[PDB]
Amino acid sequence: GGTHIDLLFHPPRAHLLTIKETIRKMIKEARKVIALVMDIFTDVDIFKEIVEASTRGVSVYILLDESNFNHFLNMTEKQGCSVQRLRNIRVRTVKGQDYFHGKMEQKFLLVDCQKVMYGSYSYMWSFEKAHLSMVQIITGQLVESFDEEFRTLYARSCVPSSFA
Amino acid sequence: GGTHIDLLFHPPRAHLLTIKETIRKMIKEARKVIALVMDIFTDVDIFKEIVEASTRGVSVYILLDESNFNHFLNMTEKQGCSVQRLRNIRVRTVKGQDYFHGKMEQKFLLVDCQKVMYGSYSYMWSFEKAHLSMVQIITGQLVESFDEEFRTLYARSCVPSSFA
Ligand SMILES: Cc1nnc(Nc2cccc(F)c2)s1
Ligand SMILES: Cc1nnc(Nc2cccc(F)c2)s1
C-alpha cells in the first residue's frame, strides 16, 4: 500500500510523451470517473477528450476557479458544445476569500481513483507552447488524499451563475 | 531509500501549522543550502527568514520567473535590503518561450538536499490571506529529482538586467 511518483516536464526531459499527450492518454483511458480541478481551462483538445470520455459513460466532475470561469465558458461556446446539456459532466466553480478576487490556486487531474496528475500545468495553449512546467504522475495510496481533497473542494463549490 | 509525502493546505486541514509557518520553519532550520524556485516573491516575512538564513552562512540560490522579477526587486528595495550585496544569496531569472511572455510556471523550496515543499503556494500576501492552495512536504528519494530539476533550471537562468 505504497505510492509511486514519476515526474514529467515541459519541455520533456527523459520521457517520451509531453504533459499534454499524457493528459489526453489519461482521459482516453478513463473507465469510470474523471475529477478535474483547474485554474484556467481553454485547451480545446483536452476539452474534446473529456467530452468524448463522457459519451463513453465516464462521469466527469470539473471544478474551475470562479474568476477565470468565463474563459472556459467562451471556449465551450466557440466549440458549439454547451456543457450544461452534456449529461455525464458537472461543472462547478470554487473561489478563495476576496479583498481583487481570492482564487482556487490548485490543480490536478484524478482518473478512476487510480492515477493523479498533479503540478503546474494549466489547460491552456500557453502551457503547450510558451511556459515551462512540471507535473507528477501519482499512483497508490496518496491518490486517496486527492480523492478526499476533491470532495472537500466540491463541497465548497457553487453552480456557475450562467447555469439555470 | 523510499519517499515520504505529507500534504498541507491553505486553509489548514488536519495539521497544526499553516503553509507559511511551515515555509518559515523550513528556512529557519536550514543548515547548508536553500534552493528556491518561485513565480512571484513579494512576501516580506519569508524574505526576512531567507536573509537571516544567509547571515548564518546558508547558501541561498533563488530562481524567479523573469516576467515577475520586478515585483521581487521592488520588495527588496522597500525593505532596504539590496540582494546583489548579500554575499550568500544568488538570484537569477528564468523564462519560457515568448509569443505575451513565456513564463517559468514551477515552484518549489528545497532545503539541505533533505526536504522539499512542492505545490501551488506563491510567496505573496494573497496566498496567506486570499487564495486556496496546497503543497506537499517531500522527503527521501524524490528530493534528488528536485535537486536535478533545480540544477537544470539554474543552467538555463540569466543574471537579472539590473545586476551589474
Ligand atoms: C476521485 C473522486 N472524488 N469523488 C468522486 N466522486 C464524487 C461523487 C460525488 C461528489 C463528488 F464531488 C465527487 S470520484
Ligand atoms: C538542491 C541543490 N541544487 N544544487 C545545489 N547547489 C548548486 C550549486 C551550483 C549551482 C546550482 F544551481 C546549485 S543544492
Answer whether B135's CB lies under 8 Å from B52's CB. Answer: no
A49 min Cα distance to partner chain B (Å): 24
End-to-end CA distance of chain A: 44
Is A106 in contact with B134 (Cβ distance < 8 A)? yes
Nearest one of A67, A70, A65 to A93, comparing CA atoms: A65
State which ligand 1 atom lies nearest to the alpha carbon of A151: 12
Pairing relationship of beta strands B108-111 and B115-119 according to DSSP bridges: antiparallel
- Please enumerate in sequence order all residues whose Cβ is within 8 A of that of A151, keeping only pairs 6 or more positions apart, or say none: none
Answer whether B75's CB lies under 8 Å from B44's CB. Answer: yes
Residue nearest to atom 7 of ligand 2 (CA): B151
- The CA-CA-CA angle for residues B131, B133, B139, to 5°, reads 150
Total CB pairs under 8 A between chain A and B: 90
B140 C-alpha to center of ligand 2: Å? 17
Residue nearest to atom 9 of ligand 2 (CA): B151
- The whole-angstrom separation of Cα B140 and Cα A118 is 19
> Where are chain B's structural domains?
1-164
Is B102 in contact with A3 (Cβ distance < 8 A)? no
Is B131 in contact with A7 (Cβ distance < 8 A)? no
Tell me the three cell numbers of residue A132: 515551462
- The whole-angstrom separation of Cα A54 and Cα A38 is 18
Task: Using a CB–CB cutoff of 8 Å, tell me whether A107 touches chain B.
Answer: yes
**DSSP states along B63-82:** EEEGGGHHHHHHHHHHTT--
Three-state secondary-structure class, residue A88: coil
Answer whether B144's CB lies under 8 Å from B12's CB. Answer: no
Alpha carbons within 13 angstroms on the beta-carbon side of residue B31 total: 4
Nearest one of A126, A95, A153, A119 to A26, comparing CA atoms: A119
Which uninterrupted H or E stretch holds A65?
strand A59-65
Q: Residue written as cell 487531474?
A: A109
State which ligand 2 atom lies nearest to the alpha carbon of B146: 1
- The whole-angstrom separation of Cα A16 and Cα B131 is 35
Task: Using a CB–CB cutoff of 8 Å, tell me whether A155 touches chain B.
Answer: no
Q: Is A46 exposed, middle or buried (0-12, 13-18, 19+ CB in 10 A)?
A: buried
Query: Which ligand does the CA of B157 lie closest to?
Result: 2
Q: Which of residues 9-48 of A touch B (CB under 8 A)?
A: 9, 13
Determine phi and psi for A32, rounding to 5 degrees.
-135, -55
Tell me the three cell numbers of residue A47: 476539452
- Listed in sequence order, the DSSP H helices in chain A are 19-28, 44-55, 69-78, 125-129, 142-155
Residues in chain A: 164
Answer whether A65's CB lies under 8 Å from A40's CB. Answer: yes
Q: Which of residues 115-154 of B touch A (CB under 8 A)?
A: 120-122, 126-127, 129-134, 142, 145, 149, 152-153
Tell me the torsion sign for CA atoms A31, A35, A38, A41.
positive
- The whole-angstrom separation of Cα B4 and Cα B137 is 8
Is A99 in contact with B129 (Cβ distance < 8 A)? yes
Answer whether B74's CB lies under 8 Å from B90's CB. Answer: no
Tell me the torsion sign for CA atoms A122, A128, A132, A135.
positive
Cα A82 from chain centroid (whole Å): 18
CA-to-CA dists, residue A80 to A39, A159, B60, B83, B151, angstroms? 22, 21, 51, 52, 45
Total Cβ atoms within 10 A of residue A94? 22
Query: Which mutation among A151, A152, A158 tests ligand 1's pocket best, with the greatest number of atoms within 8 A of CB?
Result: A151
Q: Name A33's bridge partners.
A: A59
Determine phi and psi for B121, rounding to 5 degrees.
-85, 120
A153 C-alpha to center of ligand 1: Å? 10
- The whole-angstrom separation of Cα A116 and Cα B142 is 17
Tell me the three cell numbers of residue B67: 516576467
Answer whether B132's CB lies under 8 Å from B104's CB. Answer: no
B82 min Cα distance to partner chain A (Å): 28
Answer whether B150's CB lies under 8 Å from A122's CB. Answer: no
State the resolution, in angstroms: 1.7
Under CATH, domain B1-164 is a member of which superfamily?
A: Endonuclease Chain A (3.30.870.10)
